[model samples]
Target: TGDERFYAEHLMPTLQGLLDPESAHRLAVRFTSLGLLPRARFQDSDMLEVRVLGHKFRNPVGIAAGFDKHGEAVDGLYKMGFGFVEIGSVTPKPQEGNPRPRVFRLPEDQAVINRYGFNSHGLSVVEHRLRARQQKQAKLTEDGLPLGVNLGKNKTSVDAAEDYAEGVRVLGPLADYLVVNVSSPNTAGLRSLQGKAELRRLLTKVLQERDGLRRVHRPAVLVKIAPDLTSQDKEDIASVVKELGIDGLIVTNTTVSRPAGLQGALRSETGGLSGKPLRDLSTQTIREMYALTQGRVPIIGVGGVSSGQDALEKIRAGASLVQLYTALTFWGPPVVGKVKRELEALLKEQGFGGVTDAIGADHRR
Candidate 1:
């Protein structure tokens, strides 16, 4: 816990100024370039295994999308102790995304708001990087780690589903799973695609294309939803997932709605808010999603998971797996290990056999 204060005072503040929004992203790249970001390290090796979406994971904890916008950090991040790493909400073409000051730090609220706008190095560039990593990882000892490729639309694309289709066309072969990220609020009209009609059309097209690409490798295709959706929207999403028979659901991307506690100095920030303030909303969304889905599809709970207990809560709420991004920014690399250790202890104390058994255990009470 001593490192907490050090990060809180000395390290975080300094990084906050130096990193900013865009540069901090580049800093993550720099760490990946140096192979410094923590890899997937399992402490409770025997008990940590779980299967979802036709692939096995070393543990249920994973790095969320947006952190690795380009596929550059997969190896280093996986090495740093993540069970899985998702790279990019990549578009068909490269984009500069939103202008500078697109990301803001809300330390007082233990939150970060980012409107990064799917700023990626393009599908072809990312595909090349992933293809190389796949080739390298295929030859390496740590070859089977799960890597999810997150697909997003470009800023210029009016037909968003085509963008997703393009990502699938190019990157499906190299990914362990593919997440259709239609949730980010940063894109101008991205969330509109989450509608039942739009989502169904997009997902159907994406799956058809993905199936065509893989005779041997049918990658898991999951949908990532926004935390800001209404109850009706949640019901609609659950219905679509059932109708489409999608592989999984990522409970949330960052939220556009600010919680009551975060409304002080940094309240006016323009980007999607993520971190502690997101804890309740994210969990509640998961609970609702479980209710709607009736536990048919696996849910990857994300948003505001800053501690072991936070991660455990998501597991209990209905998430078969969980992820976090903002907390990593605030807590640094050791955060993943800390959360995993805490989660293991919590599971044992609660007499659960493993992570999957604990799913949806606390939805009502």
Candidate 2:
């Protein structure tokens, strides 16, 4: 826990003095450029190897979108031992998100509230950086890593569907998969687009545009949904996803609904709530979605995942894979290895051969 405080007091102040949050992000990019973060490495046979949308990940544990918004730091993230990394919520054009103090730590609650509003360096910036990374990896003779790029509409964009389409077109070539980030509550009116009619229209347009971009190169398209959605909303989304034959569903973004038990100043902050507070709600949503889809689609579970058991709970609840950001912020890079070891023990204790067997098995009740 003090790791974050140390980062804030020692690392953040220095960063803040020199730049605003957006500018600080460039500094983060530079830090990543120098490979300053700790290396994440974990090898465990218990990790579930999953193939979805034509991509094979070494394990099911992944870094969620928003951790590396600009796609800069992806190679480093993979080196840190993640099975995969999902970067960006990049828009077609760059825009400063919300205002200062958009990201805050709720230490007491073991949570974070972020209203960064998808402040990203836009498609061009990500495209250039991704190209350089690809080149660097090739020169080093490193095995190519699986990467997912998440796309969102710009803050002020009125024709949001077009923004989603443009994002897919620009970033699709560089990504193994492209996630349509329509669930975050921070972006204005973004959640409304998740409705049946709007989602149908938006995804149809995105798919059409994605298909038109050299048929041989269409990246897997996934829809990221929110944990706060009601049962009716979940049903609506499941129908759309099934009808469109999309690749998969990222079962959550962040929740606007706070669990009844919460404490501290950050609790009052207005933004998307993430961490332990969201685990059950998110897992439940995944279970319901997986069932509604009749196991036709895969679910990437995220939210409130802090331990190996927590991760297993998600898998049993119907998540084909799992991801996290807040927990990483609290526990640091080594948390990946910690989780892997504990998860292996958990699997053996539970009498499961591997991660896949546990997936949706707990939903049988």
Candidate 3:
């Protein structure tokens, strides 16, 4: 608790200005990998628990993909009281992503523009880290902490589907849930994989690989989608998900389309934009995706989710759970409890029994 205010109020602001954004991000993850952050002081109440994807999420707030891309900080992040922690937009092969200065900040808007592509340590290394974690933190994770791996294609892979299938085959057993991220705008031609025909092919291959795994009770595979989708695009995606019976959807990834009222020169930096600038667009996408899927599928709404009101809005918009990364970039681990506690209070005040009752409340009205 002492570390919370000190980092959030004093240390973070100073470091934000002092360090290169990407360097700062790496340092944060590296330090966490070394087991440096404090454990959460408060426990989540039943009011904030969520049941989704055949797993019990103790709370709805999770660390989004890209926070700990290498699987090094899973227990460290979980210790901070996040209901879940998703690691990586990890690729099949090691890739450096784009050139330097790829991460830029828009402090005024409480946003970030990142084109890190899928900079990853690749599957083998991550697998080793996760496997070691299974034995090391068996007791810690046994209490029902959902860990997800978000897999991406290599920069030069010939068949993106194979790359995704490889990720599923190798890392599937190590995850509670698996994500095939066909939505990050950083990779060239990655977003194009979201088209109906392409999506069907990609997901079918990935799903088959998952379904055929030797282990019983294989991890659930969910697709993470971009927020910049057209009506047609949504329909195509929804239909494919239904036909394939995909386990769920990570309702929205970062957005390529920047909205108005963005401040500063960094606004022009190219990459997917996330945080407060992306709040409404991500929620709107969730509202539509929830409808397009006819509320049959679960959605993890993410993007600009910095407050309890923001998270509640996502739940009402039909997100079964929510994730936050940019907020962690701005505030420290304290934001997790802050958001969860606020959401619990809001749900109680609104007369909902819990998070499940709140999902798609907007649609019902």
Candidate 4:
């Protein structure tokens, strides 16, 4: 309790006020890697465990991609009590991404606008780190939290599909799950791959590479999509997903559409917006995708989630798992345990015996 209070009222505020957004994030990651932050020990609870993509997640909550671009602090983040951690929108080769001042905080709206692009250390570096980590902790897969890699293409790459295929070839064995991230708005022409034809080709190539891996080594593959899709766009993507047999869908990445009445001046900044403003839109997309696929496809709902109620809302809207990144920027590491505790209590109050029971409950109604 003292740890939680100190983070919320003192440490977090001091960091936010003293440093710029990107610098503060760097410090947070450094602290986590060094094991300086307070760690939450998860209590065994049926309401928190979730089974998806043939892997058992300790809980439904996970840290979204972008927070750990280089796969630096997987163990530290797991120690913070996340059910899983998805690292990197990693590219085949290292890229510097856009210029500095690319990340902005909207404290007034509890949101973030980022144009960091796909800044990453490339596959070789990340692979070495992962391999070293696995060697040090032999029980990583057997007992530790699930880990995921979100793959992205280089800005100058001529063929996006090939870039993703290269990622699958190298990182597929290391990831518990691999996300084909074609939704980030900061990358030029990246979202174009979300188009049905382009997506079909990209996924086909990536999956082919994945299938080539040894059966025991292949990771479940998921596709991350943008929130700004049209109804027809969603339908087409849904059709392709079902036909291709993709493992899951990460419903709604950060949005390019600025919601009305955002109070922060940086709200006018160009980039994808994530947090409170994107919440309902992301949920709406989750609801649509769930209905479109008839709930056959598992969805990882992300955007604007910060509390137990918000996490539950995604479950009711048809998400099997939920993710948060912007919320972590506002709330400190303790937010992970806070949300899990709240979600457990809410599950019991609503007469649900487990997390799965509450999923897509609203759709049933």
Candidate of highest TM-score: 4
| Steric clash pairs (candidate 2) | 40-80, 275-304
Provide the clashing-pair count of each candidate structure: 12, 2, 0, 0
The 0-to-1 C-alpha lDDT of every candidate, in the order given, reads: 0.82, 0.80, 0.88, 0.90
Q: Following a full C-alpha superposition, what root-mean-square deviation does model 3 have from the true structure?
A: 1.5
Candidate 2, 29-64: lDDT as tens digits = 567656777554456463467666676667778889
Model 1 agreement with the true structure over 65-142: per-residue lDDT tens digits = 988888887778876678888888888999888777788778788888887777889998998887766767544314
- Give one digit per residue, the lDDT tens place, for model 4 in 159-231: 9999999999899988889999999999989888988987898898889999999987799999999999988
- Runs in model 4 lying further than 4 Å from the true structure: 135-138
Model 3 agreement with the true structure over 230-268: per-residue lDDT tens digits: 899989999999999999999788888878889857998
Per-model TM values vs. the true structure: 0.94, 0.89, 0.96, 0.98
| Count of clashing pairs, candidate 3 | 0
Best by lDDT: 4
Best-first order by lDDT: 4, 3, 1, 2
Give candidate 2 regions above 4 Å deviation.
1-33, 135-144
Question: What are the C-alpha RMSDs, in order, of all predicted structures?
Answer: 2.2, 3.7, 1.5, 1.2
